Design an enzyme around this catalytic site. Structure first.
Site, PDB file in Angstrom:
ATOM      1  N   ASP A  80       3.080  12.296  16.632  1.00 17.87           N
ATOM      2  CA  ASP A  80       3.257  12.520  15.191  1.00 17.87           C
ATOM      3  C   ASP A  80       1.907  12.655  14.501  1.00 17.87           C
ATOM      4  O   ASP A  80       1.613  11.956  13.519  1.00 17.87           O
ATOM      5  CB  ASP A  80       4.082  11.385  14.572  1.00 17.87           C
ATOM      6  CG  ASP A  80       4.487  11.661  13.125  1.00 17.87           C
ATOM      7  OD1 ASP A  80       4.395  12.826  12.669  1.00 17.87           O
ATOM      8  OD2 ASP A  80       4.891  10.698  12.436  1.00 17.87           O
ATOM      9  N   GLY A 118       7.651   3.720   2.988  1.00 13.24           N
ATOM     10  CA  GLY A 118       7.743   4.748   4.005  1.00 13.24           C
ATOM     11  C   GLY A 118       9.166   4.892   4.490  1.00 13.24           C
ATOM     12  O   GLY A 118      10.024   4.086   4.135  1.00 13.24           O
ATOM     13  N   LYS A 125       1.999  -3.211   8.938  1.00 13.83           N
ATOM     14  CA  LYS A 125       3.126  -2.308   8.845  1.00 13.83           C
ATOM     15  C   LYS A 125       4.401  -3.094   9.117  1.00 13.83           C
ATOM     16  O   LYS A 125       4.563  -3.684  10.189  1.00 13.83           O
ATOM     17  CB  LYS A 125       2.975  -1.138   9.813  1.00 13.83           C
ATOM     18  CG  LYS A 125       4.171  -0.188   9.776  1.00 13.83           C
ATOM     19  CD  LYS A 125       3.862   1.131  10.456  1.00 13.83           C
ATOM     20  CE  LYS A 125       3.092   2.074   9.543  1.00 13.83           C
ATOM     21  NZ  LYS A 125       3.103   3.507  10.019  1.00 13.83           N
ATOM     22  N   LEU A 148       0.822  -1.209   0.000  1.00 16.57           N
ATOM     23  CA  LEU A 148       0.000   0.000   0.000  1.00 16.57           C
ATOM     24  C   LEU A 148       0.858   1.261   0.000  1.00 16.57           C
ATOM     25  O   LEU A 148       0.397   2.344  -0.374  1.00 16.57           O
ATOM     26  CB  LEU A 148      -0.941   0.006   1.206  1.00 16.57           C
ATOM     27  CG  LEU A 148      -1.883  -1.198   1.306  1.00 16.57           C
ATOM     28  CD1 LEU A 148      -2.731  -1.122   2.551  1.00 16.57           C
ATOM     29  CD2 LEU A 148      -2.767  -1.262   0.064  1.00 16.57           C
ATOM     30  N   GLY A 149       2.106   1.130   0.430  1.00 11.77           N
ATOM     31  CA  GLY A 149       3.000   2.273   0.418  1.00 11.77           C
ATOM     32  C   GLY A 149       4.355   2.004   1.039  1.00 11.77           C
ATOM     33  O   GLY A 149       4.481   1.230   1.986  1.00 11.77           O
ATOM     34  N   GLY A 170       9.386   2.049   7.386  1.00 13.99           N
ATOM     35  CA  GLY A 170       8.702   0.791   7.168  1.00 13.99           C
ATOM     36  C   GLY A 170       7.743   0.905   6.006  1.00 13.99           C
ATOM     37  O   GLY A 170       7.512   1.999   5.481  1.00 13.99           O
ATOM     38  N   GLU A 171       7.191  -0.229   5.600  1.00 13.40           N
ATOM     39  CA  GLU A 171       6.201  -0.265   4.526  1.00 13.40           C
ATOM     40  C   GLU A 171       4.839  -0.641   5.089  1.00 13.40           C
ATOM     41  O   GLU A 171       4.728  -1.063   6.238  1.00 13.40           O
ATOM     42  CB  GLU A 171       6.609  -1.264   3.443  1.00 13.40           C
ATOM     43  CG  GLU A 171       7.962  -0.991   2.792  1.00 13.40           C
ATOM     44  CD  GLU A 171       9.132  -1.392   3.677  1.00 13.40           C
ATOM     45  OE1 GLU A 171       9.063  -2.468   4.308  1.00 13.40           O
ATOM     46  OE2 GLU A 171      10.113  -0.620   3.750  1.00 13.40           O
TER      47      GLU A 171
HETATM   48  C1  LIG Z   1      -1.057   7.454  -2.292  1.00 13.21           C
HETATM   49  C2  LIG Z   1      -0.257   6.568  -1.331  1.00 13.21           C
HETATM   50  C3  LIG Z   1       0.386   5.411  -2.099  1.00 13.21           C
HETATM   51  C4  LIG Z   1       0.800   7.369  -0.574  1.00 13.21           C
HETATM   52  C5  LIG Z   1       1.198   6.684   0.763  1.00 13.21           C
HETATM   53  N1  LIG Z   1       0.145   6.838   1.777  1.00 13.21           N
HETATM   54  C6  LIG Z   1       0.098   5.799   2.815  1.00 13.21           C
HETATM   55  C7  LIG Z   1      -0.754   6.293   3.989  1.00 13.21           C
HETATM   56  C8  LIG Z   1      -0.937   5.250   5.062  1.00 13.21           C
HETATM   57  C9  LIG Z   1      -1.540   3.953   4.497  1.00 13.21           C
HETATM   58  N2  LIG Z   1      -1.812   3.058   5.615  1.00 13.21           N
HETATM   59  C10 LIG Z   1      -1.119   2.963   6.823  1.00 13.21           C
HETATM   60  C11 LIG Z   1      -1.736   2.036   7.668  1.00 13.21           C
HETATM   61  C12 LIG Z   1      -1.196   1.717   8.959  1.00 13.21           C
HETATM   62  C13 LIG Z   1      -1.023   0.373   9.338  1.00 13.21           C
HETATM   63  C14 LIG Z   1      -0.474  -0.008  10.575  1.00 13.21           C
HETATM   64  C15 LIG Z   1      -0.065   0.973  11.486  1.00 13.21           C
HETATM   65  O1  LIG Z   1       0.504   0.616  12.707  1.00 13.21           O
HETATM   66  C16 LIG Z   1       0.218   1.244  13.894  1.00 13.21           C
HETATM   67  C17 LIG Z   1      -1.092   1.605  14.209  1.00 13.21           C
HETATM   68  C18 LIG Z   1      -1.394   2.210  15.416  1.00 13.21           C
HETATM   69  C19 LIG Z   1      -0.380   2.477  16.337  1.00 13.21           C
HETATM   70  C20 LIG Z   1       0.925   2.110  16.040  1.00 13.21           C
HETATM   71  C21 LIG Z   1       1.253   1.500  14.823  1.00 13.21           C
HETATM   72  C22 LIG Z   1      -0.213   2.307  11.115  1.00 13.21           C
HETATM   73  C23 LIG Z   1      -0.762   2.668   9.878  1.00 13.21           C
HETATM   74  C24 LIG Z   1      -2.878   1.553   6.919  1.00 13.21           C
HETATM   75  C25 LIG Z   1      -3.950   0.653   7.059  1.00 13.21           C
HETATM   76  N3  LIG Z   1      -4.081  -0.047   8.258  1.00 13.21           N
HETATM   77  N4  LIG Z   1      -4.892   0.473   6.088  1.00 13.21           N
HETATM   78  C26 LIG Z   1      -4.764   1.186   4.937  1.00 13.21           C
HETATM   79  N5  LIG Z   1      -3.796   2.078   4.653  1.00 13.21           N
HETATM   80  C27 LIG Z   1      -2.885   2.227   5.666  1.00 13.21           C
HETATM   81  C28 LIG Z   1      -0.632   3.415   3.402  1.00 13.21           C
HETATM   82  C29 LIG Z   1      -0.471   4.468   2.284  1.00 13.21           C
HETATM   83  C30 LIG Z   1       2.418   7.349   1.407  1.00 13.21           C
HETATM   84  O2  LIG Z   1       2.319   8.106   2.364  1.00 13.21           O
HETATM   85  N6  LIG Z   1       3.692   7.040   0.882  1.00 13.21           N
HETATM   86  C31 LIG Z   1       4.888   7.650   1.468  1.00 13.21           C
HETATM   87  C32 LIG Z   1       3.921   6.135  -0.245  1.00 13.21           C
END
Ligand SMILES: CC(C)C[C@H](N[C@H]1CC[C@H](n2cc(-c3ccc(Oc4ccccc4)cc3)c3c(N)ncnc32)CC1)C(=O)N(C)C
Length: 447
Positions: A302, A192, A211, A189-190, A195-196
Site C-alpha cells: 500500500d 482513518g 496506531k 493525529l487523524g 484505525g486512528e
Molecule cells: C491533515 C491530517 C489530519 C490528515 C490525516 N493524515 C494522517 C497521515 C498519517 C499520520 N501518521 C501515521 C503514523 C503511523 C503510525 C503507526 C503506524 O503503524 C505501522 C508502522 C509500520 C508498519 C506497520 C504499521 C503507521 C503510521 C504516524 C506517526 N507515527 N507519526 C505522525 N503521524 C503519523 C496521521 C495523520 C489523514 O490521512 N486522515 C484520513 C485524517
C-alpha cells in the site's frame, strides 16, 4: 576485558539505568540488543546504558568530526542540512574502499550552488593517512587540523564538523508486547478507515505515536506473526516499530513523526514550498527504503504518499509496510469502504490479487507523481473505471509541469503493464540518488 567511553548526555529514565554527562567512564560487561551491561566504577551506579550513547576507547567514534555507520548519500544530506557552513565536514568509513576513509566537505560555487565534495583518504601500509601523496599524516586528527589551516588543494578549508543531534534513546529493554495502561493517548493525529493515529506518552517518559486499530479489523495471532517480521525491518527510511498491544483492539506503537504524512506535508504551507531538488531527494529517500524492503524479500502492499511519514528534520520514513496483509475482510471492515485504492494499484494486483515487489514498483511510480504535483490526486478528472480501461490501452498520466523529463521516464518504467519489465528498487535508488550528480566524478581528484 573490554572498555568504552560515553559520548552524550543521558541519565536514568528506567530503574536500573546510569548517569553520565559529556562523556564519563564505562566498562561493558557484555552486550545485548541496544542496551549494554555497563560497569561505572566512577559514579559506581551500575546497570544498563544505551549502546549508541557510548564509544570504544581506541577508535574514532569519540571524535566530533567522525560519523560512523553513515552512507555517502547520508553524508551529503546531513552536510547540506540548514545550520552547516561552507567547509563543514565529516570523516566517514569508505563505502567503496573497505577499511579506509572518506572526507566529505560542504562546498559552494555560483554555478552549481550548494554541493558536497568527497575525497579518498588512503591509509599507508605502515601507518598514517593521506589524501594527496605530498601531504601525509600520522593520525586523522592531524589530517583534520592540517586542512583546517588551509584548503591545500581541497575545494574549501575545513571549518567545523557537520552538525548532529544526540541519537534517539533505544526502546525499553524487553518491552515488545506492552500493557495498554502503559500508554496515555494525548492528541488524535487523524481518523482513518481501519484505525486512528494518536500522539501518546509511554510510561510517562517517552513520546510516541500509536496506531489504534478498529475493533474487528485484525486478530491477535495473525497480526503478531506479521508484526514480528515488521519489527526486524530496521532502516533509516522505514518508521521504527517500538511495541504492540496484543489484545483487541490492537495498538501499534512507533516513533512519532512531527510533520505527519508526506501527503500532509506537501499540502502544507511549509511543504508546498520545497524546491524540485528536495522533492527528488524525498523520492530518493523513499526509493532507498523500498530497496531495503526489496532486499529483504518483503512487500509493502500500500505504497502512497499518505503512507510516507516526514520527520522534523525532513527525513522520509515508510510506514504501514505489510499492514494491509493482516487487515481482515469481514462485516466490520467492509462498512469502512474499499481496502486499497484503484488509482495506486498495479493492474495485476487489482485483477488477480498478485501483490509483489513489482506491484509496489508500480505504486512507487504513482507516488513519484504525487510528489512532483505536491499531492494532487492521481489521474485528475478520471473515474476509477476510466483509469483501468485507459491503462489497458497504454494511457499513462502525462508529464506535468515542473517535472524533469528523466523523473517522468522513471515513472513510465514503473508503469510497465508487465511486472517483469518494471525496474528494481535497487535500480530506482541508484538513478534517484545520482539524479543531479550523474556524469560526475565520484571523488575529487586532488593534485
Ligand atoms: C491533515 C491530517 C489530519 C490528515 C490525516 N493524515 C494522517 C497521515 C498519517 C499520520 N501518521 C501515521 C503514523 C503511523 C503510525 C503507526 C503506524 O503503524 C505501522 C508502522 C509500520 C508498519 C506497520 C504499521 C503507521 C503510521 C504516524 C506517526 N507515527 N507519526 C505522525 N503521524 C503519523 C496521521 C495523520 C489523514 O490521512 N486522515 C484520513 C485524517
Amino acid at each position: 576485558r573490554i572498555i568504552v567511553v560515553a559520548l552524550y548526555d543521558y541519565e536514568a529514565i528506567h530503574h536500573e539505568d546510569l548517569s553520565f554527562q559529556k562523556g564519563d567512564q564505562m566498562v561493558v560487561l557484555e552486550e545485548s540488543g541496544e542496551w549494554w551491561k555497563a560497569r561505572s566504577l566512577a559514579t559506581r551506579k551500575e546497570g544498563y546504558i544505551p549502546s549508541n550513547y557510548v564509544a570504544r576507547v581506541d577508535s574514532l567514534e569519540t571524535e566530533e568530526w567522525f560519523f560512523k555507520g553513515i552512507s555517502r548519500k547520508d553524508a551529503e544530506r546531513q552536510l547540506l542540512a540548514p545550520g552547516n557552513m561552507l567547509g563543514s565536514f565529516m570523516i566517514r568509513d569508505s563505502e567503496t574502499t573497505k577499511g579506509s576513509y572518506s572526507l566529505s566537505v560542504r562546498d559552494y560555487d555560483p554555478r552549481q550552488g550548494d554541493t558536497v565534495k568527497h575525497y579518498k583518504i588512503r591509509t599507508l601500509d605502515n601507518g598514517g593517512f593521506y589524501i594527496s601523496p605530498r601531504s601525509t599524516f600520522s593520525t586523522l586528527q592531524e589530517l583534520v587540523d592540517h586542512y583546517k589551516k588551509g584548503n591545500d588543494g581541497l575545494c574549501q578549508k575545513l571549518s567545523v564538523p557537520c552538525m548532529s543531534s544526540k541519537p534517539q534513546k533505544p526502546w525499553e529493554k524487553d518491552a515488545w508486547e506492552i500493557p495498554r495502561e502503559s500508554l496515555k493517548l494525548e492528541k488524535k493525529l487523524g481518523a482513518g478507515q481501519f484505525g486512528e493515529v494518536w500522539m501518546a506518552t509511554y510510561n510517562k517518559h517517552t513520546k510516541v505515536a500509536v496506531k489504534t486499530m478498529k475493533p474487528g479489523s485484525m486478530s491477535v495471532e495473525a497480526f503478531l506473526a506479521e508484526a514480528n517480521v515488521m519489527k526486524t525491518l530496521q532502516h533509516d527510511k522505514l518508521v521504527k516499530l517500538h511495541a504492540v498491544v496484543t489484545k483487541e483492539p490492537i495498538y501499534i506503537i512507533t516513533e512519532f513523526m512531527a510533520k505527519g504524512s508526506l501527503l500532509d506535508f506537501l499540502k502544507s504551507d511549509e511543504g508546498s514550498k520545497q524546491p524540485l531538488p528536495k522533492l527528488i531527494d524525498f523520492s530518493a529517500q523513499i526509493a532507498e527504503g523500498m530497496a531495503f524492503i526489496e532486499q529483504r524479500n518483503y512487500i509493502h502492499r500500500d505504497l502512497r504518499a499518505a503512507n510516507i511519514l516526514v520527520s522534523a528534520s525532513l527525513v522520509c520514513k515508510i510506514a504501514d509496510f505489510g499492514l494491509a496483509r493482516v487487515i481482515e475482510d469481514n462485516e466490520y471492515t467492509a462498512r469502512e469502504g474499499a481496502k486499497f485504492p484503484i488509482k495506486w494499484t498495479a493492474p495485476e494486483a487489482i485483477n488477480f490479487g498478485s501483490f509483489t515487489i513489482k506491484s509496489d514498483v508500480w505504486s512507487f511510480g504513482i507516488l513519484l507523481m504525487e510528489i512532483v504535483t505536491y499531492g494532487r490526486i492521481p489521474y485528475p478528472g478520471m473515474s476509477n473505471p476510466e483509469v483501468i480501461r485507459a491503462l489497458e490501452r497504454g494511457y499513462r498520466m502525462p508529464r506535468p509541469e515542473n517535472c524533469p523529463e528523466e523523473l517522468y521516464n522513471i515513472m513510465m518504467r514503473c508503469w510497465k503493464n508487465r511486472p517483469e519489465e518494471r525496474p528494481t528498487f535497487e535500480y530506482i535508488q541508484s538513478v534517484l540518488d545520482d539524479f543531479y550528480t550523474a556524469t560526475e566524478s565520484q571523488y575529487e581528484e586532488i593534485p
